[PDB]
User: Fold Chorismate-pyruvate lyase from Escherichia coli.
Amino acid sequence: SHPALTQLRALRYSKEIPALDPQLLDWLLLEDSMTKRFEQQGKTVSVTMIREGFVEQNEIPEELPLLPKESRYWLREILLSADGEPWLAGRTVVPVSTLSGPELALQKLGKTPLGRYLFTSSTLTRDFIEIGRDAGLWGRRSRLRLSGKPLLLTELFLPASPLY
Assistant:
């Protein structure tokens, strides 16, 4: 798709959280998407849609080991911009079994940027967070649960983002 997503997917992620500046840790560990924290930089946050749709297991080789094995997944790839400047690449993989209740909205976001602010009646927890780095750029990979139901979110922080 876009080279930022290719890069994102190929980061070598692990559960090692490096010994980083606390403010950088707070960015990487945030138990939410980056949308509202990027807005708090004094920015309007927008989505560039790279791909979204239902896919089979063969299009989620990175996420499949980390999710239930089932027939279909919602796959969403975006670039996230702040005042029009790309700051993040995001890749979300949602098993269809997660798409129930308020979490049906995960397939209906369109250009609305993901975040907990959209899920005002759903618990959010995180099963794990992995960190990776490539070419000087940080990425992270999380298995999230919304009302107990899993999804995979992988994010790559692009060079203009405030992490750097």
